[PDB]
Amino acid sequence: VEFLGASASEWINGGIRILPGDKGEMKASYPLYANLEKALENSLSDLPTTTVSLSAETLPDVQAGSVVLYRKFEVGEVITVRPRANAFDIDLHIKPEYRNLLTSNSVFWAEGGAKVQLNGSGLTVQASPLSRALKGAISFDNLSGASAKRILYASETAARAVGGQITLHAFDAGKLAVGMPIRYLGIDIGQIQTLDLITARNEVQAKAVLYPEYVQTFARGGTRFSVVTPQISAAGVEHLDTILQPYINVEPGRGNPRRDFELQEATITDSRYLDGLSIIVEAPEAGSLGIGTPVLFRGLEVGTVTGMTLGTLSDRVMIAMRISKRYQHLVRNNSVFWLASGYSLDFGLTGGVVKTGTFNQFIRGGIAFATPPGTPLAPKAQEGKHFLLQESEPKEWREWGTALPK
Amino acid sequence: VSLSAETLPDVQAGSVVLYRKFEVGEVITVRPRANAFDIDLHIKPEYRNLLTSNSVFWAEGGAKVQLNGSGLTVQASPLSRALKGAISFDNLSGASAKRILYASETAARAVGGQITLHAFDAGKLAVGMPIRYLGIDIGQIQTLDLITARNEVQAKAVLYPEYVQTFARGGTRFSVVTPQISAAGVEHLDTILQPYINVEPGRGNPRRDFELQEATITDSRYLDGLSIIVEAPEAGSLGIGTPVLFRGLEVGTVTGMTLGTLSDRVMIAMRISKRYQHLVRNNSVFWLASGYSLDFGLTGGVVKTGTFNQFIRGGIAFATPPGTPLAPKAQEGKHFLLQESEPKEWREWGTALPK
Amino acid sequence: SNSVFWAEGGAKVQLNGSGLTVQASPLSRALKGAISFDNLSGASK
Report the amino acid identity of residue C18: S
The stretches of C1-45 forming alpha helices (DSSP H) are: 27-31
Burial B168-187 (b: 16+ CB within 10 A, else e): beeebbbbbbeeeeeeeebe
10 Å Cβ neighbour count for B94? 16
Residue A303 · residue A321 · CB < 8 Å:
yes
The verdict on B61 touching C (C-beta cutoff 8 Å) is yes
* Residue A192 β-bridge partners: A208
Task: Name the DSSP letter for residue A132.
Answer: H
The residue of B6, B7, B10 whose CB has the most chain C CBs within 10 angstroms, and thus the best one to mutate to test that interface, is: B10
Residue B230's nearest CA partner among B216, B244, B251 is: B244
Q: What is the rounded (10 degree) CA torsion for B94, B100, B104, B109?
A: 0
Shortest Cα distance, chain C CAs vs residue B137, angstroms: 18
Coil, helix or strand at residue A159: helix
Burial class of residue A303, CB neighbours in 10 A (0-12, 13-18, 19+): buried
The verdict on B279 touching A (C-beta cutoff 8 Å) is yes
Query: Closest to B306 (Cβ–Cβ): which among A134, A172, A341?
Result: A341
| Whole-number Cα distances in Å, B330 to A368, B65, B279 | 40, 55, 9
Query: Closest to B62 (Cβ–Cβ): which among C15, C17, C20?
Result: C20
φ, ψ for residue B75 (rounded to 5)? -105, 120
**Pairing relation of β-strands B136-147 and B285-289?**
unpaired
For chain B, the C-alpha Rg in angstroms (whole number) is 28
Burial class of residue A398, CB neighbours in 10 A (0-12, 13-18, 19+): exposed
CB within 8 Å of B51: residues ≥ 6 apart: B1, B43, B89, B91
Residues of B within 8 A of C25 (CB-CB) are 10, 12
Residue B8's nearest CA partner among B140, B117, B116, B101 is: B101
Residue B157 · residue B131 · CB < 8 Å:
yes
Shortest Cα distance, chain B CAs vs residue C9, angstroms: 18
Contact C19 B63 (CB under 8 A): yes
Residue of chain A with shortest Cα separation from B296: A347
The verdict on B34 touching A (C-beta cutoff 8 Å) is no
Which subunits have 3 or more CB–CB pairs within 8 Å of chain A? B
Residues of A within 8 A of B217 (CB-CB) are none
Which subunits have 3 or more CB–CB pairs within 8 Å of chain C? B
Residue A218's nearest CA partner among A260, A188, A254 is: A254
Task: Name the DSSP letter for residue A232.
Answer: B
Report the amino acid identity of residue A322: R
Resolution of the structure, angstroms: 3.5
φ, ψ for residue A181 (rounded to 5)? -70, 150
Residues of B within 8 A of A135 (CB-CB) are 78, 80
Task: Name the DSSP letter for residue A120.
Answer: S
The verdict on B248 touching A (C-beta cutoff 8 Å) is yes
Residues of C within 8 A of B194 (CB-CB) are 17
Residue A69's nearest CA partner among A118, A117, A128, A124 is: A128
CB within 8 Å of A85: residues ≥ 6 apart: none
Do chains A and C have 3 or more beta-carbon pairs under 8 angstroms?
Answer: no
Residue A249 · residue A263 · CB < 8 Å:
no
Residue of chain C with shortest Cα separation from B36: C38
| Whole-number Cα distances in Å, A55 to A81, A139, B46 | 10, 15, 21
For chain A, the C-alpha Rg in angstroms (whole number) is 34
The verdict on A80 touching B (C-beta cutoff 8 Å) is no
The residue of B65, B66, B68, B191 whose CB has the most chain C CBs within 10 angstroms, and thus the best one to mutate to test that interface, is: B65
Q: Is A101 left (phi over 0), alpha (psi -120 to 50) or beta?
A: alpha
Coil, helix or strand at residue C38: strand
Please write down the long-range contacts of A235-239, taking CB distance under 8 Å and 24 or more positions apart: A235/A363
The verdict on B21 touching A (C-beta cutoff 8 Å) is yes
| Whole-number Cα distances in Å, B293 to A26, B39, B239 | 109, 73, 20
Q: Is A8 left (phi over 0), alpha (psi -120 to 50) or beta?
A: alpha
Task: Name the DSSP letter for residue A174.
Answer: S
Q: Rounded distance, CA B206 to CA B202, Å?
A: 10
Residue A170's nearest CA partner among B181, B219, B244 is: B219
Report the amino acid identity of residue B186: V
Q: Rounded distance, CA A251 to CA A244, Å?
A: 23
10 Å Cβ neighbour count for B312? 14
Residue of chain B with shortest Cα separation from C16: B65
φ, ψ for residue B310 (rounded to 5)? -65, -20
Residue B306's nearest CA partner among A230, A348, A388, A290 is: A290
Q: How far is CA B57 from the centre of its chain?
A: 29
Residues of A within 8 A of B224 (CB-CB) are 202
Residues of C within 8 A of B62 (CB-CB) are 20-22
Shortest Cα distance, chain B CAs vs residue C13, angstroms: 11
Contact B74 C20 (CB under 8 A): yes
The stretches of A138-278 forming alpha helices (DSSP H) are: 156-160
Q: Rounded distance, CA A173 to CA B136, Å?
A: 7
Q: Rounded distance, CA B196 to CA B125, Å?
A: 9
Report the amino acid identity of residue A143: L
Residues of A within 8 A of B304 (CB-CB) are 341-344
CA angle B287, B293, B294 (to 5 degrees): 130
Handedness of CA A148, A149, A151, A152 (dihedral sign): positive
**Pairing relation of β-strands A224-227 and A248-251?**
antiparallel
Residues of A within 8 A of B347 (CB-CB) are 284-285
Residue B4's nearest CA partner among B109, B92, B96, B99 is: B99
Residues of chain A numbered 113-142 and touching chain B (CB < 8 Å)? 113-120, 127, 133-136
The verdict on C39 touching B (C-beta cutoff 8 Å) is yes
Residue of chain C with shortest Cα separation from B64: C19
Residue B272 · residue B318 · CB < 8 Å:
no
Q: Rounded distance, CA B23 to CA A272, Å?
A: 58
3-state secondary structure chain B: CEEEECCCCCCCCCCEEEECCCEEEEEEEEEEECCEEEEEEECCHHHHHHCCCCCEEEECCCCEEEEECCEEEEECCCHHHHHHCEEEEECCCCCCCCCECCCCHHHHHCCCEEEEEEECCCCCCCCCCEEEECCEEEEEEEEEEEECCCCEEEEEEEECCCCCCCCCCCCCEEEECCCCECCCCECCCCCCCCCCEEEECCCCCCCCEEEECCCCCCCCCCCCCCEEEEEECCCCCCCCCCEEEECCEEEEEEEEEEECCCCCCEEEEEEECCCCHHHCECCCEEEEECCCCCCCCCCEEEECCCCCHHHCCCEEEEECCCCCCCCCECCCCCEEEEECCCCCCCCCCCCCCCC
CA angle A241, B311, A238 (to 5 degrees): 15
The residue of B19, B60, B83, B136 whose CB has the most chain A CBs within 10 angstroms, and thus the best one to mutate to test that interface, is: B136
**Pairing relation of β-strands B285-289 and B335-339?**
parallel
Contact B71 A118 (CB under 8 A): yes
Do chains A and B have 3 or more beta-carbon pairs under 8 angstroms?
Answer: yes
| Whole-number Cα distances in Å, B98 to A28, B1, B40, B43, B56 | 68, 11, 13, 17, 11
10 Å Cβ neighbour count for A402? 13
CB within 8 Å of A150: residues ≥ 6 apart: A54, A55, A106, A107, A108
* Residue B155 β-bridge partners: B117, B144
